[PDB]
Design a protein around this nucleic acid. Structure first.
Lengths: 63, 46, 93, 102, 77
RNA sequence: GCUCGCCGGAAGACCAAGGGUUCCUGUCCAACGUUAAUCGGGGCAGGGUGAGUCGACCCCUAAGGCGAGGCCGAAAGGCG
RNA sequence: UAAGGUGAUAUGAACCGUUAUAACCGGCGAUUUCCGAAUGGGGAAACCCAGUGUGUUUCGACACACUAUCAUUAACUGAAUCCAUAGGUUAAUGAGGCGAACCGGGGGAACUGAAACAUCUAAGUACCCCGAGGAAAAGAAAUCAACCGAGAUUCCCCCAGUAGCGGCGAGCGAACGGGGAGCAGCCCAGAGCCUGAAUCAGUGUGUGUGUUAGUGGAAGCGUCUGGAAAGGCGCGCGAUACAGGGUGACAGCCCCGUACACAAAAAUGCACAUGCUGUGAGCUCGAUGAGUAGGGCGGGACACGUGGUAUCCUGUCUGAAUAUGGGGGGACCAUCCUCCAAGGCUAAAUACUCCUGACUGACCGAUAGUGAACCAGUACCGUGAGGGAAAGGCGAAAAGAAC
């Protein structure tokens, strides 16, 4: 949800958006479809968090 | 021998399907009047 | 390789049958569950892109989700797809 | 202004329950409240796997009206009236109930 | 509608009357023809379409109407 | 499950128009079933359905609609 | 503004915040699927098939942004051809689809009113087609007047149901002018000096004022009655403030609210001041509305139907002058007076209301008020356009099936 850094070296924050398509949503959706950890907030950790990052990635130039 | 209408699916679109109406200015009035009546069945081929 | 990473929306659910852990003790081919589009052109490589497991042969079929849900409000039911994938020497997919 | 608040204890002066002590738990739509220790309702509860205390019935809390509730004075077990004013922060007592106008 | 340009012409509605004054509605029309002209600044010979008595008002101004008021708010040649 | 009866160029079995969960299994009877409902073209849940070669589809297209250029009709609309 | 919140049926687990990055309210922005103007190209609406460049790739293929059409302005290349133009191409500017009413130009009935019907009326309505603006239409005189002059346009009340028109039949009906509502006049047919002029549309800044957050701001207690009071009784207290609506039965004073008090991140309507972009003064000397005015006839339009018919429009034949020249002054002539066509733009009084934010009703209360108070334009029916139900109702509290 929260970070202490703001739009420096955005090329690595955009490279985290590649892991978001290769593993992090695959594992989270499969884990929840497996009923594991039993947390309903855990499937709510990508929403409203990644939008803050994708907003700064709409201005990744000058980072 | 037979009564009423034939069940064939191509003649269920080739008179009143979306493009067959949208390509005619009076057929666009069916869409306008149904939006003005609030009717959910805006297409009747299904 | 080849296609976009955004295409890999697949294999996000365990198979619905208790057969999922016995299929490889009967034959060389395991069962998987997929979405409304099973990515037929990518799925034979998607297993390497998600599990690093490779398969010899692939097939996909539809399991029709039925329709009856609420008598009068007629609520949507959604179809699902099932895959049969052949393993040379492995068993965990 | 507000007149009840959750920051300290209150006294109910309303229907079913009057002259009795409590504190706010939660606020509801269009202005109703739930208050600690109110007389509650019997309630069956249709069977569920949740813990529901020994024997039958849950004995469940009920919401109350907010128009006939006051702040509790502690010293003599009565209502208190002072008024509240403060800018840009959490409100502060203004102490005006002194019969000062003409 | 018929292209008339320099004459402003449009279709027009009128009437016919009998000896008992009975009314029969009639329509009037522009009668059109295509003409060849020389203006030199286009290098090519130019071809324009106007209604009757149109050339008799173009020829008043030599080339001025042909290079402006005819084409500029009308049709190309 | 066994008779007896009837169709047998059909009252057998496919292709087509069309229909779409009716297939295999448990469970239920608020409503259906021209008489009971234990049964299901019924209500609720489960199980299974994998083709480049068969049907779409697609390459070539008839009759033909639409139509760049282009030419008509106050105008909806005309023709190619 | 702040201690509340995570839409509802819809509960149950669970989570975010109570101190600044929890919802919430006010402003300004991000991202905005596939189809639809829908725009590579194709199509059965949410479908199918492609290329160029970039990235990499034993070259298959996907991403990334990109590729509809036409006009207008500026230019590069250009078919018969020569010069040109059509096509091709880049930048700029415009058009493209949908909505409630008003409105501009064009098309356009029958039934009906004439106690029948034929000119007249119905009616340039109903309805359709192309399209424009906050309004549109109209305007600063080629108008009327009448020896006395009026004087931009428009809508309301009058002149007037008059002057007049009409198978003189039914019916139709001017203006000029008076009162009142509204109050700035210029350009083009050119270009020189002048040079930002007086002005205006948009916008910023300043202020003043609406509009979109908001916070403060008066007075009633007990007792009996009762399921419960605000009733009764005791008697009180407030007022620049007794409307509307709640709290266990009907409290001015319990609560919401009212009269009253206070202010400016940002956005937007108005007014004055004023920068910025565009447009534009002043002065002098030029220029001056030609297939249409006139001359006839047919028809249409004006209140006015061809009559004792001008005006205004346009179908056709004929067809000017340059100011004592020319239109008009309601057949026609002579004499006088009046205005300057053949080229345009204006603010406001005028028409209308989908819609932003609010306030009320001698307003209805389920056979009434919207088809329509309830997941009603739904069910249901139709080749389809289209048509279109029946079903409103506890309580102080949901305390609802523990068992």
């Amino acid at each position: 949800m929260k970070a202490k850094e703001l739009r420096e070296k955005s090329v690595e924050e955009l490279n985290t958006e590649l892991l978001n398509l290769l593993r992090e949503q695959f594992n989270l959706r499969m884990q929840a479809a497996s009923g594991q950890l039993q947390q309903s907030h855990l499937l709510k950790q990508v929403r409203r968090d990644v939008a803050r990052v994708k907003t700064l990635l709409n201005e990744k130039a000058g980072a | 021998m037979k009564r009423t209408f034939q069940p064939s699916v191509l003649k269920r679109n080739r008179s009143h399907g979306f493009r067959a109406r949208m390509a005619t200015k009076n057929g666009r009035q069916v869409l306008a009047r149904r939006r003005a009546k609030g009717r959910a069945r805006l297409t009747v081929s299904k | 390789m080849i296609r976009e990473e955004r295409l890999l929306k697949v294999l996000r659910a365990p198979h619905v049958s208790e057969k999922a852990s016995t299929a490889m003790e009967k034959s060389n081919t395991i069962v998987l569950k997929v979405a409304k589009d099973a990515t037929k052109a990518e799925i034979k490589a998607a297993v390497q892109k998600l599990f690093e497991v490779e398969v010899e042969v692939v097939n996909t079929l539809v399991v029709k989700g039925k329709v009856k849900r609420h008598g009068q409000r007629i609520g949507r039911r959604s179809d699902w797809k099932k895959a049969y994938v052949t393993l040379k020497e492995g068993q965990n997919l | 202004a507000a007149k009840i608040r959750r920051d300290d204890e209150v006294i109910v002066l309303t229907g079913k329950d009057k002259g009795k002590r409590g504190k706010v738990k939660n606020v509801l739509s269009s202005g109703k409240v739930i208050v600690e220790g109110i007389n509650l309702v019997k309630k069956h509860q249709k069977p569920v796997p949740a813990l529901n205390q020994p024997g039958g019935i849950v004995e469940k809390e009920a919401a109350i009206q907010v128009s006939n509730v006051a702040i509790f004075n502690a010293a003599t077990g009565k209502a208190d009236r002072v008024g509240f004013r403060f800018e840009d922060g959490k409100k502060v007592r203004f102490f005006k109930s002194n019969s000062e106008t003409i | 509608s018929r292209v008339c340009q320099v004459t402003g012409k449009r279709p027009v509605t009128g009437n016919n009357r009998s000896h008992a004054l009975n009314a029969t509605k009639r329509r009037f029309l522009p009668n059109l023809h295509s003409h060849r002209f020389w203006v030199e600044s286009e290098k090519r010979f130019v071809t324009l379409r106007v209604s009757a008595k149109g050339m008799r008002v173009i020829d008043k101004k030599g080339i001025d109407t042909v290079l402006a008021e005819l084409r500029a708010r009308g049709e190309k040649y």
